[PDB]
Amino acid sequence: GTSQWLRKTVDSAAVILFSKTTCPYCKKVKDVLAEAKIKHATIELDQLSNGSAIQKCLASFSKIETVPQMFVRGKFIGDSQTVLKYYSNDELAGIVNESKYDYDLIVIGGGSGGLAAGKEAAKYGAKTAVLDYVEPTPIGTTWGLGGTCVNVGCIPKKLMHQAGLLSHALEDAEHFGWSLDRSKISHNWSTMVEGVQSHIGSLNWGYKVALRDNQVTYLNAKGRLISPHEVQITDKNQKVSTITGNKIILATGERPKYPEIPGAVEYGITSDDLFSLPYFPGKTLVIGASYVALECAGFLASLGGDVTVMVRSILLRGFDQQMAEKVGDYMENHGVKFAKLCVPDEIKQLKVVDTENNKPGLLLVKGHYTDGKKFEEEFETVIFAVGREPQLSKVLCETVGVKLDKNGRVVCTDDEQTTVSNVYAIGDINAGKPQLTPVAIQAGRYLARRLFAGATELTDYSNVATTVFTPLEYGACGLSEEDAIEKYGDKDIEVYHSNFKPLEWTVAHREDNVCYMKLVCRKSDNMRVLGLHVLGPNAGEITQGYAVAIKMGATKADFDRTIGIHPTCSETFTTLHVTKKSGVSPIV
Amino acid sequence: GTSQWLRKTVDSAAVILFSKTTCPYCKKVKDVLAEAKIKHATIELDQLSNGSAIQKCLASFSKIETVPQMFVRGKFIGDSQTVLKYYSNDELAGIVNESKYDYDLIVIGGGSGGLAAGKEAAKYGAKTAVLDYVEPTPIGTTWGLGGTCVNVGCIPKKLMHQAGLLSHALEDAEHFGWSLDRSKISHNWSTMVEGVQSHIGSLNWGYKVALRDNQVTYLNAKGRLISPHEVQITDKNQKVSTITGNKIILATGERPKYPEIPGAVEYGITSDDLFSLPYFPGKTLVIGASYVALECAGFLASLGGDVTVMVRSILLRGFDQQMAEKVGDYMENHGVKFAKLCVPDEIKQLKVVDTENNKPGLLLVKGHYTDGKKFEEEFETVIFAVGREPQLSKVLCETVGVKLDKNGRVVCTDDEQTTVSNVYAIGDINAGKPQLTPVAIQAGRYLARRLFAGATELTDYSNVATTVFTPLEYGACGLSEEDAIEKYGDKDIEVYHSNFKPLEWTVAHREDNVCYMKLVCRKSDNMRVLGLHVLGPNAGEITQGYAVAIKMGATKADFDRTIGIHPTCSETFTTLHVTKKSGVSPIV
Numbered sequence A, B: 001g002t003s004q005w006l007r008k009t010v011d012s013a014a015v016i017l018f019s020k021t022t023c024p025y026c027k028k029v030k031d032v033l034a035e036a037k038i039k040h041a042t043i044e045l046d047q048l049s050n051g052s053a054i055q056k057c058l059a060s061f062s063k064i065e066t067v068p069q070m071f072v073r074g075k076f077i078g079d080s081q082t083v084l085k086y087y088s089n090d091e092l093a094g095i096v097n098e099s100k101y102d103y104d105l106i107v108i109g110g111g112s113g114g115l116a117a118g119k120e121a122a123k124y125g126a127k128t129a130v131l132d133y134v135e136p137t138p139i140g141t142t143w144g145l146g147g148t149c150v151n152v153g154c155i156p157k158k159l160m161h162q163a164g165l166l167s168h169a170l171e172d173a174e175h176f177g178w179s180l181d182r183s184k185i186s187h188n189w190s191t192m193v194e195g196v197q198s199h200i201g202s203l204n205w206g207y208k209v210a211l212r213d214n215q216v217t218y219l220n221a222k223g224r225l226i227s228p229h230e231v232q233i234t235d236k237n238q239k240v241s242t243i244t245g246n247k248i249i250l251a252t253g254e255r256p257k258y259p260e261i262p263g264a265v266e267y268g269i270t271s272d273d274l275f276s277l278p279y280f281p282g283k284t285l286v287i288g289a290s291y292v293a294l295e296c297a298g299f300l301a302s303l304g305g306d307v308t309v310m311v312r313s314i315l316l317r318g319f320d321q322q323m324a325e326k327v328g329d330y331m332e333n334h335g336v337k338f339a340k341l342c343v344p345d346e347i348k349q350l351k352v353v354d355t356e357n358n359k360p361g362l363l364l365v366k367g368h369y370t371d372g373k374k375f376e377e378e379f380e381t382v383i384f385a386v387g388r389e390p391q392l393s394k395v396l397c398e399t400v401g402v403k404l405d406k407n408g409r410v411v412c413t414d415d416e417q418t419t420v421s422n423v424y425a426i427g428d429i430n431a432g433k434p435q436l437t438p439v440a441i442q443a444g445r446y447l448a449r450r451l452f453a454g455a456t457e458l459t460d461y462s463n464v465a466t467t468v469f470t471p472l473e474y475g476a477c478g479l480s481e482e483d484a485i486e487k488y489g490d491k492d493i494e495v496y497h498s499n500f501k502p503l504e505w506t507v508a509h510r511e512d513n514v515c516y517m518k519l520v521c522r523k524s525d526n527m528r529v530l531g532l533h534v535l536g537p538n539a540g541e542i543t544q545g546y547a548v549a550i551k552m553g554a555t556k557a558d559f560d561r562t563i564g565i566h567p568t569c570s571e572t573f574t575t576l577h578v579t580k581k582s583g584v585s586p587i588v
């Protein structure tokens, strides 16, 4: 147990020191490695409950049982007198750089997970390379280092969401006494895009600076794993070459899908293109009903667009469906049109995009409803948000032996190991995991610590909270109500709910009974909170803190005994009492 | 003993039915009481883990061990056959209304705690009177039913805080692409006050409607306890009379103090006057340094005012002083002036308030610094916020025997009982308890349930979360850093901390390193989280949810294993790692 942990740790750490905080011999080795700028992991045996056993086990490798003991890539290098000898003789640098491979770690993909993993590994002396390449979209859009969230995901989406929220702020200000007239103010799309892109550019630069200052090699090159330890790279000039690494982390993410209909690739766009578009989209059709589809339709309408969403079946498939319908009803009440039970059959081009005058084109969209009636209408911009998929055939030779599932994602053990023992996968391509930036960051940091610093902590993928940044935001943590009932049965499930009105909405004359929250609980387990849901402003700030409590096993009793902060929206969770079974109305 | 809980429940309840959910005889009794419009408490014995022993103990009062059994004010009334006999003989209404006192409960004070206690008691058939009277301020300001928070506290303060926040929203909107020019926009104080006062009026009317719909007698009259069961009332026409009650709840709150200096009462105002003031305060001096003082100074400056704060010693005494200093620095950088280490000596009138043209007067303030130097400057409005105190002399006669402390607050047991067995106190006048509106509401509802429905749950006053709504808001739960070090020793305390920047502040070009958060933890108790602190936008929404986790005993490992929601301010709590002992900088 201890011995099996010690062997895995010694075998895969690049540079690691076994030590005690009280030992001045260990301190003298620490000072020598620091002076020579040699980074390494450290395990302080006196701060572990079974340091005694570990000290004994080290002898199976070094034939000594004292501290310090220093190792490089699975090899015992020496005790204090031996390390000092190598240093004094100008031999230590060459010893710590000796390796069978070019790199201790190669990360394929420079996004949320891959950047996190690579920087963390380098902290412990692992010689690291991070590869990143951005295949341009069909119209040629491309961007810098940092992945989907930084460049064409969470960051620009929430900034445009905030531009949309500020329109209601301008309306609210009149009621709170400010002299402006909202009716005489307009929005300039390209001014907003310039500011968003300027912040994204600071992020691109900041990541390149951070890899430099951690001695990580950054290659702006497309990678392909051709054997367990060999990565083929293709640079911007089409020069092909091969590098080797001990450990491989696959972190290449996904890209948007297009439906297989005439005109889609040629004349529509995706979210990849939207966040840097030089012109305002104009009258827009959004095809799809994911959170990407609704968030984009939402802020486009708040910025003055004429917007329609075409929905194949339901909104937010996989989310609690009562909450999804409340989300959609609010958008429909504040300007978004919906073409329900409808799919597209073709896109026809009526005008080409005007690069000169900076204006969209014009399109004719033909489709049909599930009963066979026809859809036909003209739009200036058509955005497809119909899912995302990995392209691992471009990343992964079939002969390496890395197993994939029926969706093309990588099958991994609970420590992110693929079917090939030195190869791991993290982020959106890890099958069955929540596809979110903080998950990918936590998985990559934790994995790097296990590979190169002897850590054991695993990433916990259960009960991970989410927020959908629609015009009225939807936060959630845990099970939907229909999932809870399916798993435990209706008689074992109690639901507490209530409407509420933000105090900020009162003087602004906004709606009385639109915001909503519920707790889904299990009767036979001390009224354990199985799921939490809230529709209202700042839903991400509201929901985050409760995710710690649900992680700890919170029950309805724990919510009741905690006192609220007044006046907040979030405090309504501490006094819930109306049950759905009672039939009593949840209005205020 | 089960027996002594049953004895206290039977003695104190107004009308209580002991029942079982499966028994059709209990069913017919419930329907009869419903048709007769007789409200009552119900104890369903088949849902309690010792309903067996309770059935046996009921024999001590009724000489029967079956169910249903009805009691009224400590007297057994009968089983199913007997209750029906009374109903069909038109004797039931007289039997349930027979009592030694006019009321089962008299509440003195119609605020946060008192209204909540009174409405809750009435649901269990307690015949209830609620007394409220608002003694006018020195300039004659008065208001309606609902207490300090509703009329001159949390509600108007946070609505004017929101008016101030909207000013920065106007400036932000230009950077996000909206065509307005913030420089040409001004604020109208009286328009804001009208909207705020219209919302307060709807709450005044709502509480009167609530009391009427719960059959609660509302007397707009000053009440005085003269013996354990006798309350002397004085109405608006000076008419004096007496009413009697079984239980009494004191819930009369506090009012602001004035310093004992010339001119203060005559020419200054307090928060009581500020929220309905008919003219803009103009150039304003706020005297004091509590949360009331800083919150009022902050929104006044955001609405265009010229504002100074005179500080005797420190800001926010009793709060974490590192956080208090960050709060004040932000305020000083954004337009609030501070006259530090300074007290006032006298207020001289230069110009009377102009009621007709709706203009403030003009004042000369004289004071001095703790080293001896002099302060002299003119202001149009001087606001005192130097504490609040009860006036229980006006409420309670010395001879009744209710013990007070050296501050004038009522000394209570952990179930709100005074030194007089039928008299309880709740809210701000309960000595040693946190003085907050949700605390008073929870104490009131829980006390009512114990008196009239046989409940046993107590109010938990520990680790109650707070938020100070200064221009940059400050939320907290648990111990300050200095208090934890004093209690446990510096070597046993670890503090994790970080600056952060809201995503919304990036395009708006706001400050990089002013928002700040920290966790104060106990090493020898598994890194238990002893206190959480956050300075940033929406701080009360951020803080509330973690209050549940802290109530459950969260440790640092609990915060680490929970995943963040991105992009939010609150997610920074899930990845903290820089300790103060390490000396590493916390900037981003």
Ligand SMILES: Cc1cc2nc3c(=O)[nH]c(=O)nc-3n(C[C@H](O)[C@H](O)[C@H](O)COP(=O)(O)OP(=O)(O)OC[C@H]3O[C@@H](n4cnc5c(N)ncnc54)[C@H](O)[C@@H]3O)c2cc1C
Pocket: A108, A109, A110, A111, A112, A113, A114, A131, A132, A133, A134, A135, A146, A147, A148, A149, A150, A152, A153, A154, A155, A157, A221, A222, A223, A224, A251, A252, A253, A254, A271, A292, A394, A395, A426, A427, A428, A429, A435, A436, A437, A438, A440, B565, B566, B567
């Ligand atoms: C519109 C949108 C909004 C979103 N909003 C949120 C949100 O609010 N919150 C949230 O938590 N998540 C959000 N997400 C999800 C988030 O973007 C992803 O979960 C996250 O970025 C996944 O990170 P990753 O490291 O797995 O992959 P990515 O971030 O996609 O990074 C993979 C990188 O590898 C590169 N690459 C691919 N193939 C190769 C190759 N052969 N060689 C070299 N490099 C290669 C890619 O070009 C890319 O740069 C959003 C996603 C989208 C599309």
Ligand SMILES: Cc1cc2nc3c(=O)[nH]c(=O)nc-3n(C[C@H](O)[C@H](O)[C@H](O)COP(=O)(O)OP(=O)(O)OC[C@H]3O[C@@H](n4cnc5c(N)ncnc54)[C@H](O)[C@@H]3O)c2cc1C
Pocket: A565, A566, A567, B108, B109, B110, B111, B112, B113, B114, B131, B132, B133, B134, B135, B146, B147, B148, B149, B150, B152, B153, B154, B155, B157, B221, B222, B223, B224, B251, B252, B253, B254, B271, B292, B394, B395, B426, B427, B428, B429, B435, B436, B437, B438, B440
């Ligand atoms: C400016 C300000 C801002 C605040 N902001 C917040 C905030 O954001 N959050 C928060 O949680 N708390 C806040 N508070 C505190 C909160 O208002 C109080 O904790 C709360 O009102 C206490 O309620 P209570 O029931 O104890 O007394 P009150 O609400 O003060 O009610 C007592 C009532 O009894 C009446 N009364 C007094 N004597 C008699 C008598 N003899 N006969 C009849 N009636 C009588 C009083 O006039 C009053 O109507 C704030 C307070 C102030 C002053």
Ligand SMILES: CCNC(=O)c1ccc(NS(C)(=O)=O)cc1
Pocket: A135, A136, A137, A138, A255, A256, A258, A265
């Ligand atoms: C002329 C291009 N035609 C296509 O059919 C196509 C290519 C790539 C796509 N996506 S990507 C950028 O490889 O992520 C989508 C569609």
Ligand SMILES: CCNC(=O)c1ccc(NS(C)(=O)=O)cc1
Pocket: A043, A048, A449, A453, A454, A455, A456
């Ligand atoms: C600095 C990175 N190290 C870690 O995260 C870490 C490593 C080992 C630990 N424990 S053990 C009992 O030796 O396996 C704990 C933490």
Ligand SMILES: CCNC(=O)c1ccc(NS(C)(=O)=O)cc1
Pocket: B043, B048, B449, B453, B454, B455, B456
């Ligand atoms: C709705 C009002 N009732 C209560 O709050 C309550 C009372 C007693 C309880 N339990 S007991 C019988 O004392 O064992 C539980 C709950």
